[PDB]
Amino acid sequence: FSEFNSIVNIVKTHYPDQEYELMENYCLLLDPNTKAARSALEYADANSFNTLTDKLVEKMSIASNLKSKEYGKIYEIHRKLSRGEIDVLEASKNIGKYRIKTDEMNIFSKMIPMYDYLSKGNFSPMKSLLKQIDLNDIKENNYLKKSFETRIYVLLSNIYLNENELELSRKYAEKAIKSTDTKRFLVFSYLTIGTSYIFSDYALSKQNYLSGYEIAKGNSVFEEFFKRNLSFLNNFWNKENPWINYDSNAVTDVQEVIFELINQKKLERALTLLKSLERKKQNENDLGFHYYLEGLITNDKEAFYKSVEYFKLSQDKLFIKMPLIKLESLGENPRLLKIISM
Amino acid sequence: SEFNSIVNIVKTHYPDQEYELMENYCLLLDPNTKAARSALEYADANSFNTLTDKLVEKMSIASNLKSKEYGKIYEIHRKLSRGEIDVLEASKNIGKYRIKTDEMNIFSKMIPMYDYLSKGNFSPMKSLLKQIDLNDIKENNYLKKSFETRIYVLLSNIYLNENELELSRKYAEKAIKSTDTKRFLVFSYLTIGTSYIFSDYALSKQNYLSGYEIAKGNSVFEEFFKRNLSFLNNFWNKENPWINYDSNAVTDVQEVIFELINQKKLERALTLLKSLERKKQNENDLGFHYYLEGLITNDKEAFYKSVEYFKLSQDKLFIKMPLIKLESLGENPRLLKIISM
């Protein structure tokens, strides 16, 4: 029996719209040396309540309870990495320096790099590690155990999507959904299921995005994810597109504007706007989409070759299909393009 | 170091009896002494597994703090290496001990790395390995020099798998200069040799012969150079003394076939290739198989299949074999370059 888990369930079932405002207050009244305070740390981080997580870290880092101290220090490293105040190599260095006694943090330790490595495309080795983790080793905090189960299902889901293993990606996203009531995990699961259907099934892609958008309502960052993806979906399938953010200066938003312009056959303006994105505010995966859009306008195979290269560098075996399809249309060897997509 | 002095005497004067002299000697050392510690590294660096484990067993019974600590950390290394535990349990066990020595602190960091590198995950490893500073080891120069080699060999192996052939050689050469552990010399010379398969025949050959010389006495290590020398000479259409006509193993029969193709006996090459089709074979073997079928029939389809099987087995090295042939048959050089990324 966990009193924390009992409170969360009461707040989720009876006051869902006030969840953050009730739980924030309650989490910050817990003594930092207690089991409940520890669970609160995972509850805060699993929900991406950043300011709460950081307030809990500040208290628990300097607590006298050894377990609390340990959770504090390891979540501290996680948070530093997630905010980008440090890089993964230093994160690992710091983990090494700390003597980890709990099964929970030993396992968490391993997951911390994975959030960074996943963000920038390294998949195969960490997959093996995730399947190796046995959460039955966590004997002393079933709330962490259940939360970590979800964390694993979501990571696996995301890995399998990027490997273009869409049956497996769905399997793990659905298992994540069944496993949790944490909004953030439901959001990412529905994003993943939605993205899995981008090429194969418009309606099912849309319907998984709308389910996720419903769950995301209230958090504007989570809302933005579905609107960006719904905007891509409609642009890709050449449908009327209500989801675009014309105001945003962010690269992924401006790309959706461009794609719409291409569909509207305003190719001159699409190019000038694409040409202004040439300032280096873009990761490899963003350059995939960039050179694909340029290709759609200019019909230059070079643009599509570059698009393939950037998708290959970022290890996106899903979106690499787009320029490959276009190169097939321009009469390039279908067998070689199939081999590039494996 | 008295230990380093004995090893050197045994290597120079009784190389053929190295194991049988050193095994005896290592097990007669007092387990509380620096020499017994060094023996533990000597044993593990050489993959004398029975010996390593016997020395581990002896470190538990020692009362010296440092010896006890080396015992427990090599114990974790060996448990992980035998596959009795996974990396998670390893890290868990490492956390249980407070590590006082700089050498076992550094070695504890390397233990996971051997597991993570047994299954891809390179890039993150590279940076971690270069971050280790071996100048922190003040108290055992034999471990220091052995660990330096361990680092150089891992980096070498990583860079080879990334098809960073210049960098793999750089670290293999550093490994060679750093060591007299036979198995590290063997892996370094194989690596340097393999790095030149496609770029430089003479240098590939010369590195494989140097390694063959060092491998003399060990039948497993000898076989590696003979297999690779057989491939090299077949690939460059040179006279081939390394072929094993007797062996029924797939890679040996493949070298027979390749020679027949070079001698333009395509009829016999085909019949022998056709009989390999009913033999257990991994994906990497199917790479070589369909390449040889391609060399005979000159059908693009065989070369496409060869590429696919090399891609499925994640061989970024030999995939170039089918690529080059497709280039010669007028396939898009940009698509072929992208496949070899």
DSSP states of A47-68:
TT-HHHHHHHHHHHTT-SSHHH
Chain A contact for B158, CB < 8 A?
no
Asked if residues A277 and A286 have their Cβ atoms less than 8 Å apart, the reply is no
Chain A contact for B304, CB < 8 A?
yes
Alpha carbon distance B137, B161 (integer Å) = 30
- Residue A41's identity, in one-letter code, is L
Alpha carbon distance B294, B310 (integer Å) = 14
Asked if residues B236 and B260 have their Cβ atoms less than 8 Å apart, the reply is no
Alpha carbon distance A132, A241 (integer Å) = 43
Closest alpha carbon to B93 in A99, A286, A165: A99
Q: Are the beta carbons of A333 and B335 separated by less than 8 Å?
A: yes
B116 chain-A contacts, CB cut-off 8 A: 125, 129
Name which of A92, A332, A342 is nearest B128 (Cβ-Cβ): A92
The CA angle A86-A70-A62, to the nearest 5 degrees, is 85
Asked if residues A305 and B338 have their Cβ atoms less than 8 Å apart, the reply is yes
A60, HSE (Cβ side, Cα atoms, 13 Å):
33
Beta partners for B118? Answer: B120
Residue B235 in any domain: the answer is no
Cα B258 to chain centroid distance, Å, stands at 25
Most B-contacting residue of A128, A136, A324 (CB-CB within 10 A), to test interface:
A128
Alpha carbon distance B19, B15 (integer Å) = 9
A99 chain-B contacts, CB cut-off 8 A: 95, 98
Q: Which residues contact A339 (CB under 8 A, 6 or more apart)?
A: B304, B307, B308, B311, B339
- In terms of residue numbers, what domain contains B320? 243-341
Q: Are the beta carbons of A122 and B127 separated by less than 8 Å?
A: no
Q: Are the beta carbons of A128 and B119 separated by less than 8 Å?
A: yes
Residue B261 in any domain: the answer is yes
How close B13 comes to chain A (CA, Å)? 43
Q: At what resolution in Å was this solved?
A: 2.3
Cα B184 to chain centroid distance, Å, stands at 8
A92 chain-B contacts, CB cut-off 8 A: 124, 128
Closest alpha carbon to A159 in B207, B121, B98, B235: B121
Residue where a domain terminates, one of B57, B89, B116: B116
Residue A302 in any domain: the answer is yes
Task: Round the CA-based radius of gyration of chain A to a whole number and report it.
Answer: 22
Burial-class residue A171 by CB neighbours within 10 Å (0-12, 13-18, 19+).
middle
Cα A118 to chain centroid distance, Å, stands at 8
* Method for this entry: X-ray
Tell me what percent of chain A is helix, strand and coil, each rounded to the nearest 5.
Answer: 75, 0, 25
Residue B123 in any domain: the answer is no
Alpha carbon distance B316, B160 (integer Å) = 9
Q: Cα dihedral sign for A121, A122, A128, A130?
A: negative
Residue where a domain terminates, one of B63, B94, B116: B116
Alpha carbon distance B52, B164 (integer Å) = 33
Chain B contact for A284, CB < 8 A?
no
Alpha carbon distance B26, B44 (integer Å) = 12
Asked if residues B108 and A154 have their Cβ atoms less than 8 Å apart, the reply is no
Torsion angle of alpha carbons A241, A244, A247, A253, nearest 10°? -130
Tell me what percent of chain B is helix, strand and coil, each rounded to the nearest 5.
Answer: 75, 0, 25
Residue where a domain terminates, one of B116, B138, B167: B116
The phi and psi torsions of A66 (rounded to 5 degrees) equal -65, -40
Asked if residues A185 and A150 have their Cβ atoms less than 8 Å apart, the reply is yes
What is the maximum span of chain B, computed from C-alpha positions, in angstroms? 71
The phi and psi torsions of A38 (rounded to 5 degrees) equal -65, -50
Chain A contact for B330, CB < 8 A?
no
How close B339 comes to chain A (CA, Å)? 6
B122, HSE (Cβ side, Cα atoms, 13 Å):
12
Residue B153 in any domain: the answer is no
The phi and psi torsions of B118 (rounded to 5 degrees) equal -80, 10
Q: Which residues contact A109 (CB under 8 A, 6 or more apart)?
A: A74, A95, A100, B91
What are the C-alpha distances in Å from A42 to residues A5, A214, B71, B204, B211? 11, 24, 37, 55, 54
Q: Are the beta carbons of B336 and A332 separated by less than 8 Å?
A: no
Q: Which residues contact B82 (CB under 8 A, 6 or more apart)?
A: B49
Residue B167 in any domain: the answer is no
Chain A contact for B83, CB < 8 A?
no
DSSP A263: H
By C-alpha distance, the chain B residue nearest A130 is B88
**In the A/B pair of chains, how many CB contacts fall below 8 A?**
81
Chain A contact for B119, CB < 8 A?
yes
Closest alpha carbon to A289 in A265, A333, A328, A256: A256
Q: How many beta carbons lie within 10 A of that of residue B298, not counting itself? A: 11
Tokens 């991994």 found at: B282
Instruction: Please state the domain count of chain A.
Output: 1
How close A108 comes to chain B (CA, Å)? 11
Asked if residues B78 and B45 have their Cβ atoms less than 8 Å apart, the reply is no
- The encoded tokens of residue B188 equal 């370094």
The phi and psi torsions of B140 (rounded to 5 degrees) equal -155, 95
Asked if residues B234 and B259 have their Cβ atoms less than 8 Å apart, the reply is yes
Q: How many beta carbons lie within 10 A of that of residue B131, not counting itself? A: 13
As a residue count, chain A comes to: 342
Asked if residues B134 and B151 have their Cβ atoms less than 8 Å apart, the reply is yes
Cα B86 to chain centroid distance, Å, stands at 22
Chain B contact for A269, CB < 8 A?
no
Residue B166 in any domain: the answer is no
What are the C-alpha distances in Å from A27 to residues A10, A42, A43, A321, B174? 14, 11, 9, 46, 55
The CA angle B147-B151-B156, to the nearest 5 degrees, is 145
The phi and psi torsions of B120 (rounded to 5 degrees) equal 65, -145
Residue A251 in any domain: the answer is yes
